């Protein structure tokens, strides 16, 4: 079962939670960092800001590429911020967007934003997905982010910071603390979904293996007897798929 | 469960089964279906032509794109063929070959033609583990490529030519009947494929539909009350992945 993040990855990620770019105005580096997202396939988005779904305004939300995470000031901005690419990113079809757990982001960019998000890669239900088809019955909890962190890389339980402060994401200048965290909290989800991807797709592509190799690695005689029985599948193939 | 192609699209396939290119000699026309295979992340090859396993040699080799059907003629090119770009192709991480039950062409190319057939999209452990998916026990029958265009496109049960006359498979000039038959039995292999692909991917891109939806979509009460039982499942999300 065990699956670790390599140290050499792990330190690529840990340097771009460092070089994260605070945005709070529609400006030079505003557009640039709409560029830049405009040009993935996929980009992620943090849940962060948006955990009292409808009942509250995002004060920030965080956006990120691969190779360079965002934090826009919504606070500051307001509408003028969705209205200057950020609606456009999060309503398409195309980029999709990564996220752990969406609903509640969701529900507050509808009804407090007017962006209704769409086209999503959704970690939590992907870690649903690979446990219903591992132990056939799909649990009943779902994993946090941090959950998904630990079980999918080997990070530290506490690694996400789940309790930012409610007053002191309103209050301005916005701490780096809150901002160092807003970003370690992105910085991951680009590769445990990919991570995850390939796990939810893995019993396919060992099922293919196992027929490439089912009879091409047999002797003659078991060759030519697995010919003739074609119609069933091979012995191997149950294993090889879990 | 009711899945049926549209008339439009069978019909541009039905064109393209009459379409096909034969190609008897290392020429101009063999280099220009080896760049055009080469030009494509997904061509397909028919077991067509290897129903013996390591027992046979190869008198034909059916590949295509999704535009252009091409028949190698291996009884006369032999080695040659392989060598001048086929055994790179499907020896390739890229470009994957789709296949329906490749597990006696691996067979064959290896042991006859020395050709190590790997990267491959195979349409019938697509039907297994859609199934397994879906009816939680994988069962114990596969599924012909027939039966899959049966199911998946709603095709006619004899749609597919099952059993090639051995003899005149090795005689020459190699019949326009035969001909016509390996183009029809290959030229639904990648719509089948993409219908296939779909259907594993879809108990994913459902859930994170119902997750979108899940709270965006309740009114002010049961929006609150979803938002303090996040750790557990939508009550729909069973639903929404059947």
């Known amino acids: ?132 088809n591992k132990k056939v019955t799909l649990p009943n909890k779902v994993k946090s982010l941090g959950e998904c962190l630990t079980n999918y890389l080997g990070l530290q339980q506490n690694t996400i910071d789940e309790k930012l402060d409610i007053v002191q994401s309103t209050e301005r200048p916005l701490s780096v603390k809150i901002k160092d965290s807003l970003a370690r909290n992105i910085a991951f989800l680009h590769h445990l979904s990919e991570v995850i991807n390939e796990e939810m797709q893995l019993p396919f592509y060992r099922g293919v293996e196992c027929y490439i190799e089912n009879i091409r690695s047999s002797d003659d005689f078991k060759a030519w007897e697995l010919c003739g029985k074609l119609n069933q599948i091979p012995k191997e193939f149950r294993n090889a798929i879990d």
């Open 1 to 132: 079962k065990v699956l670790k993040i390599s140290q050499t990855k792990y330190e690529e990620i840990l340097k771009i939670s460092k070089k994260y770019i605070f945005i709070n105005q529609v400006d030079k580096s505003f557009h640039e960092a709409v560029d830049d997202l405009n040009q993935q396939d996929f980009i992620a988005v943090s849940g962060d800001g948006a955990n009292m779904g409808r009942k509250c305004k995002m004060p920030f939300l965080v956006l990120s590429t691969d190779h360079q995470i965002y934090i826009f000031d919504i606070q500051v901005m307001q509408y003028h911020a969705f209205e200057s690419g950020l609606k456009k990113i999060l309503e398409g079809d195309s980029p999709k967007k990564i996220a752990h757990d969406c609903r509640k982001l969701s529900d507050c960019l509808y009804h407090k934003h007017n962006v209704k998000l769409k086209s999503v890669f959704d970690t939590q239900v992907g870690d649903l997905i690979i446990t219903k």
